[PDB]
């Protein structure tokens, strides 16, 4: 007869070995070094634009590289590409599922993508104008819902899934070029490194994994949360990233250190974090909570610097433009807003 | 709260689930579960440490199963969409309690009001002093606002009565502080600056709405 | 030659791959968090002064200025 119980121990002893290697470099926390740094002024952003057009809860949004066009996915089975400066709608795309978990904007503006409980990643060419009937490519493959997706360029997109996987696709052939396996639970979100050579992913196993795109494998596995990681975001310089989880904390992970540099939490905060995004300089970490609230964290000092949208319980998702000029918020009341 | 169920992918999953809890054609009634097994099918409720982890598979085979054997009724879909927004407003809509700007006379009173208040209530406190330009116009606006947003508690206090003298010079007056759930949500030094000399309640409102400090739309 | 892989692997097939990865990760040379932190503070401090959401945007320099 066979046995795997022993094989279950080498994993734990190895994990135990990595814990120590990490504990040997944990001399001090980020907050220690930033103790003398002045706290930022109370951050108070104002609504400048209100985007009207959706007829249901906004599930996800994503800014276009020009920091002006943005796409929003809603429970109304629609994808809308907006001109944020004028609040005008540029395109409107009818989807087949109301259950859209994510949407992406190709850095070129030629394409936009989205997917959800359909387990598929649909791509829309905005140039050939597929607004009414066409759907460039439907990326079938995942055996679980499509949690997130981000374009590397026009012929390459990376997706995360509830099937425990992440995949790199060639848009032209429509084949799962690469498959990133390793997580033991549902992949909830991913974040591309600025250089797009690397990317990171958060999952329900409570771990974030750094993956090499060109190479096709996991470089490292971060841990610390005892709960599901629901959101992840790369830091502007590519050497770190932040995570948000069901454990009501956000954590700053440094790649070179292979461990958390800081945690952001407050006793008064008890809901899971489902949205994290950095300001342009990375001084600010904005977190969106399951109760629809959003807190602005001073990434250096680990104290709350402010509140986005006055705790009106109206934020369902958010995003910061590349130029770091504005933040967008989606809402369950069907409206999107832009804050400065 | 614990695990997320309203936002992000978890939100979509929970939304799809609750949807069926109404779609089937009756919910807590006899047309749905009778085994009192569940109010809904749910995944990841009890940790299955067989693999060494607090088991977290949000979508089960039976869930993904329906997904293909599902009859997404367009009509039943729009109905559900309206019902979700209606439900959320309802929960965010708490009774019209107040309707007047209340005068706080001491620092102890200020601390007492934000401290003993329901955590769901927004408190707009106005720190002013007579004669200081802007104050009277703000107080007038507030009285009209307090009467329109009875679920928001508005208050006013002389900088002198705060118990922090010099800290509040006419240079930063009037200052408008907003609290909710025990915490300061906004601090507007020289609020009067945000408006034109002659300002009224609708201006103050447009302003507070834009920071998302006012309920009900 | 990118790697394609279907998820119908056995528990031990997964546990195997787990220990392997864990081994590769063991051989990883790490940097002292201190040196990481100093670099984090550094990058952020010198750029926060220009962060639009940190300092505020001058009204003429705001793309989303009160529309007229
Ligand atoms: Gd501001
Ligand atoms: Gd003035
Ligand atoms: Gd003045
Ligand atoms: Gd009004
Ligand atoms: Gd305005």
From Swiss-Prot, chain A:
Subunit structure: G proteins are composed of 3 units, alpha, beta and gamma. The heterodimer formed by GNB1 and GNG2 interacts with ARHGEF5. The heterodimer formed by GNB1 and GNG2 interacts with GRK2. Forms a complex with GNAO1 and GNG3. Interacts with ARHGEF18 and RASD2. Forms complexes with TAS2R14 and G-proteins; these complexes play a role in the perception of bitterness. Component of the TAS2R14-GNAI1 complex, consisting of TAS2R14, GNAI1, GNB1 and GNG2. Component of the TAS2R14-GNAT3 complex, consisting of TAS2R14, GNAT3, GNB1 and GNG2.
Name listed for the protein in its UniProt record: Guanine nucleotide-binding protein G(I)/G(S)/G(T) subunit beta-1
Pfam families documented for this protein: WD40_Gbeta
Matching InterPro entries: G-protein_beta_WD-40_rep (IPR020472), Gprotein_B (IPR001632), Guanine_nucleotide-bd_bsu (IPR016346), WD40/YVTN_repeat-like_dom_sf (IPR015943), WD40_repeat_CS (IPR019775), WD40_repeat_dom_sf (IPR036322), WD40_rpt (IPR001680)
Superkingdom as given in the UniProt entry: Eukaryota
Residues with PTM Phosphoserine: 2
Modified residues (Phosphohistidine): 266
Any GO MF annotation of the entry: GTPase binding
Keyword rRNA processing: no
GO biological processes: adenylate cyclase-activating dopamine receptor signaling pathway; cell population proliferation; cellular response to catecholamine stimulus; cellular response to prostaglandin E stimulus; G protein-coupled receptor signaling pathway; phospholipase C-activating G protein-coupled receptor signaling pathway; retina development in camera-type eye; sensory perception of taste
Residues where N-acetylserine is found: 2
Job of this protein: Guanine nucleotide-binding proteins (G proteins) are involved as a modulator or transducer in various transmembrane signaling systems. The beta and gamma chains are required for the GTPase activity, for replacement of GDP by GTP, and for G protein-effector interaction.
Gene3D superfamilies listed in its UniProt record: YVTN repeat-like/Quinoprotein amine dehydrogenase
Family designation: Belongs to the WD repeat G protein beta family.
Disulfide bonds: none
SMART domains in the record: WD40
Keyword match Repeat: yes
UniProtKB/Swiss-Prot annotation, chain B:
Family the UniProt entry places it in: Belongs to the phosducin family.
Phosphoserine carried by residues: 60
Annotated region (Thioredoxin fold), positions in chain: 98-217
Biased composition (Basic and acidic residues): 45-56
Domain annotation Phosducin: ranges: 1-217
PANTHER family, per the entry: PHOSDUCIN, PHOSDUCIN-LIKE PROTEIN
Major location category of this protein: cytoplasm
Record's comment on post-translational modification: Light-induced changes in cyclic nucleotide levels modulate the phosphorylation of this protein by cAMP kinase.
Gene3D superfamilies: Glutaredoxin, Phosducin, domain 2
Chain residue ranges for the region called Disordered: 1-57
Record's keyword terms, sorted: Cell projection, Cilium, Cytoplasm, Nucleus, Phosphoprotein, Sensory transduction, Vision
Function per UniProt: Inhibits the transcriptional activation activity of the cone-rod homeobox CRX. May participate in the regulation of visual phototransduction or in the integration of photoreceptor metabolism.
Complex formation: Interacts with CRX. Forms a complex with the beta and gamma subunits of the GTP-binding protein, transducin.
InterPro entries: Phosducin, Phosducin-like_reg, Phosducin_N_dom_sf, Phosducin_thioredoxin-like_dom, Thioredoxin-like_sf
A Pfam family: Phosducin
Cellular localisation: Cytoplasm, Cytosol; Nucleus; Cell projection, Cilium, Photoreceptor outer segment; Photoreceptor inner segment
GO BP of this protein: regulation of G protein-coupled receptor signaling pathway; visual perception
KW Transmembrane (keyword) present: no
Identification of the protein by name: Phosducin
Swiss-Prot record, chain C:
Pfam families recorded: G-gamma
This protein's record includes keyword Magnesium: no
Gene Ontology cellular-component terms listed: heterotrimeric G-protein complex; photoreceptor disc membrane
GO process annotations (BP): eye photoreceptor cell development; G protein-coupled receptor signaling pathway; phototransduction; protein localization
Function: Guanine nucleotide-binding proteins (G proteins) are involved as a modulator or transducer in various transmembrane signaling systems. The beta and gamma chains are required for the GTPase activity, for replacement of GDP by GTP, and for G protein-effector interaction.
Subunit structure, interactors included: G proteins are composed of 3 units, alpha, beta and gamma.
Name listed for the protein in its UniProt record: Guanine nucleotide-binding protein G(T) subunit gamma-T1
Name of the encoding gene: GNGT1
